[PDB]
Structures are given as structure tokens and as C-alpha cells.
């Protein structure tokens, strides 16, 4: 009952005396589609096995995403090894304006209204890691107001 997206599958190799031993990696995104998403790498000698391992890794590594009604609360910039991803909230009309990896992550997390731009490296793994880093950096109004005081010193027009 989850949403699973396999993002990138590539064939890696290792050289031995005989020749090249091939294997497969399959980066997988898994999320409940509502507010919670996980990422798992996964790797094996066969594509379905790698996909499976990615699925269990992601499902074990679920984490929670702060939404404010179908979009993220405030703009953020996430930083992976060398991938840079910029996310900004948008009005309810907009869709998900994102690239491949970022779109996978956001649509599995259950985000409907986002402008996502990748500025650093183009590797899919690092783009995914930067996106999850930005989602970690995200904040909620309720604990920012808990940290500061008098939880009205913000702007909460919609609510619901």
C-alpha cells in the first residue's frame, strides 16, 4: 500500500583475473504518499533482487516531511556530496515542477505544489540525497513558535 519509484538502474563491474564481474544497483524511492518518505539504495547481481533490497532499505529508512497543505512550508536549499537542490513552495494551482530524481522523491513524499531546481552535480544519487537533505532542513510553524514563543508571530493564512 506504498508508493515505490525506482529512479536509476546502472550496471557496475569489477575486474578479476578472468574478466569483468557485473552487478546491478537500483536506487529506489518509497513513501506512503501522504507525509512520509524513505530512500534505499540496494544492489545485487540481478535487477529484481537489487530493486527488492532497495525497497527494504527505503522502508526501513522512512522519515517524516513537514507539509502545510500540499506544499512545503518555506524555501530550502539542500546539499549532498556535490548536488545542490532548491525547493520553493507554490500556489495550489501549480504542479510539481522538478527534474527526474527530485520529482520522484517529492511525488512519493506526497507533495503537490513545489518548484525544485538542481544546481550542482547531475548524478541521480546525489540529487536524491540533496533533496532529502533539504526536506530535513524544512521546519514547521508549530515548533519554530515553540522554540521562540507566543505562537502567532508568523503568517498562517490558510491553516485548515
Amino acid at each position: 500500500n506504498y508508493l515505490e519509484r525506482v529512479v536509476a538502474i546502472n550496471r557496475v563491474s569489477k575486474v578479476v583475473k578472468g574478466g569483468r564481474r557485473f552487478s546491478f544497483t537500483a536506487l529506489v524511492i518509497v513513501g506512503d504518499g501522504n507525509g512520509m518518505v524513505g530512500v534505499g539504495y540496494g544492489k545485487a547481481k540481478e535487477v529484481p533482487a537489487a530493486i527488492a533490497k532497495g525497497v527494504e532499505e527505503a522502508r526501513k529508512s522512512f522519515f517524516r516531511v513537514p507539509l502545510i497543505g500540499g506544499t512545503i512550508t518555506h524555501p530550502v536549499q539542500g546539499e549532498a556530496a556535490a548536488g545542490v537542490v532548491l525547493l520553493r513552495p507554490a500556489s495550489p494551482g501549480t504542479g510539481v515542477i522538478a527534474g527526474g530524481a527530485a520529482r520522484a522523491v517529492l511525488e512519493c513524499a506526497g507533495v503537490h505544489d513545489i518548484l525544485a531546481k538542481s544546481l550542482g552535480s547531475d548524478n541521480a544519487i546525489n540529487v536524491v540525497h540533496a533533496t532529502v537533505a533539504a526536506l530535513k532542513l524544512l521546519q514547521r510553524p508549530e515548533e519554530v513558535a515553540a522554540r521562540r514563543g507566543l505562537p502567532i508571530e508568523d503568517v498562517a493564512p490558510a491553516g485548515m
Binding site: T73, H74, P75, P89, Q139, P141, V144, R147, R148, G149, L150, E153, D154, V155
Partner: protein, 130 residues
């Protein structure tokens, strides 16, 4: 040694990252006003002014949660001495989409974005805190 306000922000940021409970730093009226703004916005606990060997010393105690988490996420100087930055009441900056605070120096004193838009005055954008 230039830009003591950036020096103040850097000291506070480094201590906050190092999990320190308080900082000391030379006291000026501008720093005292910024500290007052930060306390009013709830990013620090109370502050005070001592008397050091020469001049006065400003001491700030930093606020942490029940667990060991920082109430201050970021800090960045905006109007640097190499490039001053000003804004009008129409287009005052917005920090974290409004979940942060930007310090504005106006003819009526230091103010935040909300307090400055409610008064309809602009000025120099000193720093973002959020």
C-alpha cells in the same frame, strides 16, 4: 578589523554551533539594540552589560530546548560595509517565507519586517536571523 556587526553575528553563530551557554563581546549601542531585538523575538535568553578592563562587555546567554537542540538555525549579515543594502516599505525582505526575522534599521530605530511594514517605513537591512 571591520564590520563589528558581522563580528557579533559570527561570534554568536560559532558559539551556538559549539553548544556554548554564553558569549562575551565588546559592547556598543548597535549591538545592544540588536540583542534587544533578538531577545524580543525569542532567539536568545536574557542578556546583560558588565564593565570590562577597558570599556564595557556585553554577555549573552543562549537558549536551548529540553533536548539539546538550538533555537537559532541561521544568521547572516546582509548590508556589508562593502555593499550597503536598503529597502522600501513596499518590498521589505522575507526570511524563511516569513518564519524568520530580518532586522531593519529605520529612522524610528531597529525594527523587524512585521513591525516595519506595520509602520510603513524602510531602511537598511542589517541581518537575517531566522
Amino acid at each position: 578589523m571591520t564590520d563589528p556587526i558581522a563580528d557579533f553575528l559570527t561570534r554568536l553563530r560559532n558559539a551556538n554551533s559549539a553548544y556554548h551557554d554564553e558569549v562575551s563581546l565588546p559592547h556598543s549601542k548597535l549591538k545592544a539594540n540588536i540583542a534587544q531585538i533578538l531577545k524580543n523575538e525569542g532567539y536568545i535568553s536574557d542578556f546583560r552589560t558588565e564593565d570590562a578592563r577597558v570599556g564595557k562587555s556585553l554577555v549573552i546567554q543562549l537558549k536551548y530546548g529540553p533536548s539539546r537542540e538550538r533555537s537559532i538555525a541561521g544568521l547572516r549579515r546582509v548590508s556589508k560595509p562593502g555593499l550597503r543594502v536598503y529597502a522600501k516599505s513596499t518590498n521589505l525582505p522575507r526570511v524563511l517565507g516569513g518564519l524568520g526575522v530580518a532586522i531593519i534599521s529605520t529612522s524610528s530605530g531597529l525594527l523587524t519586517d512585521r513591525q516595519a511594514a506595520r509602520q510603513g517605513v524602510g531602511g537598511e537591512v542589517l541581518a537575517y536571523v531566522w
